[PDB]
Design a protein around this ligand. Structure first.
Ligand SMILES: CC(C)[C@@H](NC(=O)[C@H](CS)NC(=O)CCC[C@H](N)C(=O)O)C(=O)O
Ligand SMILES: [Fe+3]
Length: 329
């Protein structure tokens, strides 16, 4: 029936250090994984993922219907026209099981020039009442910077893996302008589970979210210990093993663009599982004006004829296209 994807566990801790040869050995493993199924687990990453899943659980289970409307993105609340990305994504009982909360760069404030200029994809985060969710905002903002630091190191590994200097990507990944987002996703246990919330794939598999390529440079994902993800290969979809201690890493379609598809953006989908679980992606996005010059590591001269793509326009297009294809989450 369904085979299992080879998803190696890569000790990424050398990427935080100054042992350059050890960094290269990590880079080789990243290269191999990126050329195989496109996924690896980053282990020995230094993030307290036990507290992450705890603080997230407390929030999802304690937020009330009134608070969800008050935080809701524009897709669920016409009063909130500035909330395209950040805020609460409501479930629809009987129809849509998943619900989630998305937040962006905490440095996006009314003082920020991109907020002042009303540049697309930049928004000021919305937060629940502190007294109703003590410590939640503090946890969430600190987590953003914790995973930012992990992601910076991973980007050093990807750069070395492609034959570049280690800051080739990370130099565009900055706290003052990153469009990176965290999404705290709840997938509920439901009895009965509404069939309307289950999609059926071409191959018959029941899904919660259909196939797609990630809109990101890379995706840095923590999930609770419930197997659900699949990656498409030429021989069909393969199950990605769960690992609630590691971070599941893959390239997004911006990486595929700039490498001339040498590191493809894998096609992934989410199987339907009737189980309470958490999915907490960090989408590594660059700045709105960031441009990486494409190259082709397959060619002796490394030359690509692909257009340099401004990251902001890429992100705007990608997020709207994904909603159109796979629905409003
Ligand atoms: C597969 C997981 C990463 C997760 N899927 C997801 O997060 C899916 C597919 S990558 N991503 C999205 O819908 C895009 C969210 C973008 C976010 N609101 C933003 O403004 O930056 C899931 O569990 O459904
Ligand atoms: Fe995805």
């Amino acid at each position: 029936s369904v085979s299992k994807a080879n998803v190696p566990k890569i000790d990424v801790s050398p990427l935080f250090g100054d042992d350059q040869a050890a960094k290269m050995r990590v880079a080789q493993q990243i290269d191999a994984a990126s050329r195989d199924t496109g996924f690896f687990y980053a282990v020995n990453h230094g993030i307290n993922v036990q507290r992450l899943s705890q603080k997230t659980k407390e929030f999802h289970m304690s937020i009330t219907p009134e608070e969800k409307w008050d935080l809701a993105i524009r897709a669920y609340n016409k009063e909130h026209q500035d909330q395209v990305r950040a805020g609460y994504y409501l479930s629809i009982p009987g129809k849509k099981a998943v619900e989630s909360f998305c937040y962006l760069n905490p440095n996006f404030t009314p003082d920020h020039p991109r907020i002042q200029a009303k540049t697309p994809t930049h928004e000021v985060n919305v937060w629940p009442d502190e007294t109703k969710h003590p410590g939640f905002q503090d946890f969430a903002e600190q987590y953003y910077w914790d995973v930012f630091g992990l992601s910076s190191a991973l980007l050093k590994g990807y750069a070395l893996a492609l034959g570049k200097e280690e800051n080739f990507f990370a130099r565009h990944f900055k706290p003052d302008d990153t469009l990176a987002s965290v999404v705290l996703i709840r997938y509920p246990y439901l009895d009965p589970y509404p069939e309307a919330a289950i999609k059926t794939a071409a191959d018959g598999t029941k899904l919660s979210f259909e196939w797609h390529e990630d809109v990101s440079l890379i995706t840095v994902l923590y999930q609770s210990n419930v197997q659900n993800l699949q990656v498409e290969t030429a021989a069909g979809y393969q199950d990605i093993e769960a690992d609630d201690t590691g971070y599941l890493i893959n390239c997004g379609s911006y990486m595929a663009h700039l490498t001339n598809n040498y590191y493809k953006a894998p096609i992934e989908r989410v199987k339907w599982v009737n189980a309470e679980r958490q999915s907490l992606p960090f989408f590594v996005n660059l700045g709105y004006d960031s441009v990486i010059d494409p190259f082709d590591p397959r060619e002796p001269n490394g030359k690509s004829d692909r257009e340099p793509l401004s990251y902001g326009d890429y992100l705007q297009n990608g997020l709207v296209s994904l909603i159109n294809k796979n629905g409003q989450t």
